[PDB]
């Protein structure tokens, strides 16, 4: 600190200061006759009423904020800013490396002074900001920001000895910064920092899978609920967020085991016991937000059709779903139409193509196609992809299989013979193969039956793009898809 201040007097004649208004470094620096460096925006929004005087030393400025210094103050503020950045990088490197060297934690009062040097307490004028680990006072953010660097560097130790310190930091942030605001974001940040700390204390530690499975099982079957304590509006102990993060990793492990379970064989009689304990835990408590977390993790790791395959009627993994979502779910759970990426002009033509599927009138697709901008290549792609998604949603489903053969291929073929939008002989030789199911991409014969759908979708999408796209940077790939003897 006194290195910095004797540095500033060496730099620019006794005291480059931040502006008293903004509490930060000056932009377009105006100098008072009393050696004051202020912001230009702050002095134009401040000096124009009847306060032609000084905020700091109460000195009357005579004329106007006319002296700007285009020689001294930009390079002075530049050098002092480079110096404060280098010194704050120095301080954060020292508290990262030397204050936290080995497995024993530092003393109490040094941790208290680190947590107290984050605050810039009362000064006569916005009070009580939060700064980016600086040993100085003259750096500001005029919005209270909350980082996670000290939180991760305190939680490299055992959790049993750093509960009260982060708890006291939490009580300080609640009493001065986050009184009545969105505490959900800070609580999720704390849950994420504790779960990252347990990831580090398990993965960088050296122990086998059986001991960690036995101890998390012993956590499960001895879990007192106790949720009435840290519930209502403000009470959030670090033990409570540690319990929620620990059960989130238990459900993460259980969801990894279920994703392993569906893909392969039996789970060696001990992972079975762990999944049984996860089942007993989730069927004991009605805190089904954690079950929502389980289904969000399984939807994230594998896909939507994965939990659709879980959502059948007698699979022995049905307990991973809440009680209301299964009784009001039918067996006609159709698939997602990923081609709405085009948006608001493919949606109209696919709705009208579903209309011409259900009825026999085929002019509706032509009316929807003339109700669209964005011309001829994308329009042809919309029409061909709409025809694909309708004949695919018919042929896949067991109830309505082979529906355009029921006197309806005559109507769409009449639309082919009438409308010149797709009766180009390469588009036409594609479309004849797509109407009567004689395109050899539906018979891709992948026996997994979940990624098989995706592979069919990617193949017909890139074929639709290569046909409908009249583009130079598609001229090789067309030769890769229709002339392999010429390749």
């Amino acid at each position: 600190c006194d290195c910095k201040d004797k540095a500033s007097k060496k730099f620019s004649r006794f005291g480059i200061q931040p502006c008293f208004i903004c509490h930060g470094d000056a932009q377009d620096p105006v100098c008072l006759p009393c050696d004051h460096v202020y912001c230009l925006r702050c002095i134009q929004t401040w000096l124009i009423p009847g306060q032609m005087m000084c905020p700091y030393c109460l000195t009357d400025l005579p004329d106007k904020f006319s002296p700007t210094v285009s020689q001294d103050h930009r390079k002075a503020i530049e050098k002092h800013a480079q110096f404060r950045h280098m010194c704050n990088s120095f301080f954060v490197d020292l508290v990262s490396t030397m204050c936290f060297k080995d497995n024993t934690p530092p003393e109490k009062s040094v941790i208290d002074t680190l947590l107290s040097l984050l605050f810039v307490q009362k000064e006569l004028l916005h009070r009580e900001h939060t700064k980016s680990l600086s040993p100085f006072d003259d750096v500001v953010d005029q919005t209270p920001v909350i980082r996670s660097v000290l939180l991760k560097l305190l939680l490299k130790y055992s959790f049993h000895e750093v509960k009260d310190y982060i708890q006291n930091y939490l009580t300080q942030l609640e009493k001065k910064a986050f009184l009545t605001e969105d505490k959900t974001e800070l609580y999720l940040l704390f849950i994420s920092c504790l779960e990252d700390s347990v990831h580090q204390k398990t993965s960088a530690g050296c122990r086998n899978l059986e001991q960690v499975l036995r101890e998390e099982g012993h956590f499960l079957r001895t879990y007192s609920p106790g949720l009435q304590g840290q519930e209502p509006v403000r009470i959030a102990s670090v033990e409570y967020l540690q319990e929620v993060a620990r059960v989130r990793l238990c459900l993460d492990l259980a969801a990894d085991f279920l994703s392993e379970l569906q893909e392969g064989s039996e789970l060696a009689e001990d992972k079975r016991r762990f999944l049984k304990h996860v089942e007993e835990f989730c069927t004991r408590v009605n805190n089904d937000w954690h079950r929502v977390y389980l289904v969000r993790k399984l939807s994230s790791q594998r896909g939507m059709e994965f939990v659709q395959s879980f959502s059948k009627q007698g699979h022995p993994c049905q307990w991973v779903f809440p009680r209301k979502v299964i009784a009001q779910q039918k067996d006609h759970v159709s698939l997602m139409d990923r081609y709405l990426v085009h948006g608001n002009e493919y949606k109209a033509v696919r709705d009208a193509t579903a209309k011409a599927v259900l009825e026999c009138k085929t002019l509706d697709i032509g009316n929807a196609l003339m109700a669209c901008r964005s011309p001829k290549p994308q329009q042809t792609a919309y029409l061909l992809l709409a025809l694909y998604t309708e004949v695919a949603a018919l042929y896949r489903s067991p109830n309505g299989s082979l529906h355009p053969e029921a006197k309806q291929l005559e109507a769409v073929n009449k639309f082919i013979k009438e409308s010149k939008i797709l009766s180009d002989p390469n588009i036409r030789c594609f479309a004849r193969s797509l109407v009567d199911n004689t395109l050899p991409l539906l018979k891709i014969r992948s026996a997994n039956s979940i990624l098989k759908g995706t592979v069919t979708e990617m193949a017909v999408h890139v074929a639709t793009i290569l046909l409908c796209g009249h583009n130079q940077i598609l001229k090789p790939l067309r030769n890769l898809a229709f002339y392999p003897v010429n390749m």
Partner: protein
């Protein structure tokens, strides 16, 4: 390739599939032809490399501009009118799960975003992050460490 892309991007499975559909859809409306001077057979390495340079140009022009599109695509595909009745896409794909009546009450810790999912940070995501944020000038050692 699909396993490596859903590892490599810090998304869900559906969102990485949405990224691939974005790049195939975006490579269509790019009508500006300045892709002259290469053989259309891929017969010489200069023609292949020039094709690579123009296709790298279009892929970077579309890969820079996806993070301002993917929440809007999640809103539109979340509000399509045949999956929205299915109660599995509401508890997952962009609706609050408070319509489920058998649930704990409105607490400060039982919001939906607190019981959301998030990434598991790996090396491939780091390699993706070094190439968008101009890793060749500022951070060279990490780029060469993740490369090999």
């Amino acid at each position: 390739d699909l396993e490596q892309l859903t590892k490599m991007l810090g998304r869900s499975a559906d969102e990485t599939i949405h990224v691939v559909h974005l790049i195939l859809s975006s490579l269509l409306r790019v009508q500006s032809h300045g892709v002259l001077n290469f053989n259309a057979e891929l017969s010489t390495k200069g023609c292949r490399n020039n094709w690579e340079k123009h296709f790298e140009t279009l892929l970077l022009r579309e890969l820079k501009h996806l993070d301002k599109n993917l929440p809007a695509i999640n809103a539109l595909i979340s509000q399509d009118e045949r999956i929205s009745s299915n109660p599995v896409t509401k508890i997952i794909y962009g609706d609050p799960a408070t319509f489920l009546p058998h649930l704990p009450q409105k607490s400060i810790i039982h919001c939906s975003k607190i019981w959301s999912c998030r990434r598991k940070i790996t090396v491939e995501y780091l390699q993706h992050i070094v190439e968008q944020k101009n890793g060749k000038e500022t951070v060279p050692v990490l780029w060469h460490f993740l490369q090999k």
